[PDB]
Design a protein around this ligand. Structure first.
Ligand SMILES: CC1=N[C@H](C(=O)O)CCN1
Length: 310
């Protein structure tokens, strides 16, 4: 059978680990067959989302970092320090969240997409060519960022000069010094060898990388009750498998960056040093309320209640 599936990373990366477990589970329990499409085929994240909405692709992985333009209240995932750093507590959140698994679903549906899961990918880290010790060290650093308004507002509040750019241009831009800064989890910034074109890694603990897996809603609604269930089963099985794997990654990948490039300067900021960043976190939150109205306000409240209950 057909059923095409496209994601934003390599096969060996985290979104690939998810895809491959999803593929296993579908194929072990039916006659259906999943066809995988990693980054490097079909093009950027914006491209594959269009391809999923046009109906060429059936399943797509698109991170809220790109969907913030489409669904405005997906900007919640970029309110600094909202998401906990405790990876065990974080995994229980996305699984049992009334906000993620109930309140977000009709909003994605408004754009013709059937939301399956959201999952974490790990604590994020700044890579720059100048030292970052406080917020004023970011002053006039051209910092690449995913394409959504609030994430852009975050690095303005940090003191940097934010630049929205699709991933395909990030390595080259850094190499030719058109940009001086970038942010991603540790597994990915090792995987993409981005340490070759940056000098400093900084753990501010401001965010965890979140991503989402969805299906073309028309396609999904066309399926039988058994097929729909089969998909839901495969998504839940892929989630459980991915969270275990991505925990191991964050806990081991930094050792490999230092192995391949021993000169690399890796700073993890103390709570004392993180103070100016957490001060910016409150005014970014205030900005989020202004942009998304009372619609996204109910999402923030529930998200906080889900974190507490878990
Ligand atoms: C951590 C990650 N970064 C990519 C990016 O910065 O656009 C998206 C695929 N996954």
């Amino acid at each position: 059978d057909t059923w095409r599936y496209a994601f934003e990373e390599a096969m060996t990366d985290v979104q690939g680990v998810y895809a491959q477990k999803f593929k296993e589970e579908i194929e072990a329990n039916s006659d259906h067959e999943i066809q995988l499409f990693p980054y490097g085929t079909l093009g950027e994240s914006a491209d594959i989302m269009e391809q999923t909405q046009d109906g060429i692709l059936q399943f797509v992985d698109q991170s809220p970092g790109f969907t913030g333009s489409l669904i405005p209240e997906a900007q919640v995932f970029f309110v600094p320090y909202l998401l906990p750093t405790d990876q065990d507590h974080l995994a229980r959140f996305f699984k049992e969240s009334k906000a993620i698994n109930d309140m977000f679903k009709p909003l994605y549906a408004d754009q013709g997409l059937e939301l399956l899961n959201m999952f974490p990918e790990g604590e994020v880290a700044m890579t720059t060519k100048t030292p970052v010790t406080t917020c004023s060290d970011l002053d006039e650093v051209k910092f690449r960022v995913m394409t959504n308004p609030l994430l852009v507002e975050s690095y303005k509040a940090f003191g940097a000069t934010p630049t929205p750019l699709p991933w395909g241009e990030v390595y080259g831009g850094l190499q030719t010094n058109v940009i001086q800064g970038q942010e991603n989890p540790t597994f990915f910034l090792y995987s993409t060898k981005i340490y070759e074109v940056t000098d400093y890694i900084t753990y501010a603990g401001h965010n965890n990388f979140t991503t989402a897996v969805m299906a073309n809603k028309d396609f999904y609604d066309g399926l039988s009750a058994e097929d729909q269930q089969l998909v839901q089963n495969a998504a839940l099985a892929a989630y459980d498998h991915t969270v275990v794997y991505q925990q191991q990654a964050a806990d081991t990948e930094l050792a490999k960056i230092m192995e391949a490039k021993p000169e690399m300067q890796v700073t993890v900021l103390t709570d004392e040093q993180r103070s100016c960043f957490k001060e910016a976190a409150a005014e970014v939150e205030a900005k989020f309320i202004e942009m998304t109205g009372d619609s996204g306000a109910a999402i923030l409240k529930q998200m906080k209640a889900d974190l507490a209950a878990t």
